[PDB]
Each structure stands twice: as structure tokens, then as C-alpha cells.
Amino acid sequence: GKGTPSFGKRHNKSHTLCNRCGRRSFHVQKKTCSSCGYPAAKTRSYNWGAKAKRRHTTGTGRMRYLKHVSRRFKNGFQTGSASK
């Protein structure tokens, strides 16, 4: 055993989908995501994991508000209308 016959007993997921990052790293029994650290308030990251930081950092998504913050700064956070 311990090889092919023992691989046949693999039908119980140690991890399922994480609510916060969706990576299937949420340890079922520990109730903790091994990737993002959910449900801790901080997002798990390490400086030895530079590649992982790069994988999950700002700009890897759509940025959805922050992509416009820069234009709004450029225009000085104006509030009115363009006034034809």
C-alpha cells in the first residue's frame, strides 16, 4: 500500500471554497483559509511570499473605484457639472 491502492481512498476534501478569495483553500475543520487567512480581518501575506503577494495584490482585479481615484485627483475632486 501507501501508493496506488492508498490513493484510492481520497474522497474527502480537506479544503473547500473560501468565501473571501474563492481559491478552495478554506480548511473545513480549521475553518480558516490557507491562502488569504479568512476569517481573520487581515489578508494573509508574507514577505517571503513575494510571488504570492504579486498574485493577489492591488491591480490584479478591476480596482473598480481606485482606477478612477487618479482621474478624480487630476480634476481636483470637483463636484458640480460640466455646464455646457
Partner: protein, 50 residues
């Protein structure tokens, strides 16, 4: 499992909807370096891992 959570069924639905070849009117667009669906999945070759 035939007794599945809604989350699992929803991911299954997304996978079914995106399990399709490249739309053939793409490859007619002006520049179109896209030749085929390079993200095509199949249940016999690569597991979704949920």
C-alpha cells in the same frame, strides 16, 4: 454528489456555460490573433477542483 450546495451548483453552471468552442465570427475580426478557445475544459481531462 447529487446533494450539492448552491455554491457548487453555481460554479458548475458557470463551467457548463463556458464549455464551448470559440465563436466562429471571431477569427473574422480585423486583427484577431485569437485562433481557438485555449481555456476549454473537459470532465475527462482536467478536474475543476471545485
Amino acid at each position: 454528489a447529487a446533494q450539492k450546495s448552491f455554491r457548487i451548483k453555481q460554479k458548475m453552471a458557470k463551467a457548463k456555460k463556458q464549455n464551448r468552442p470559440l465563436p466562429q465570427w471571431i477569427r473574422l475580426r480585423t486583427n484577431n490573433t485569437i485562433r481557438y478557445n485555449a481555456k476549454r475544459r473537459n470532465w475527462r481531462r482536467t478536474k475543476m477542483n471545485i
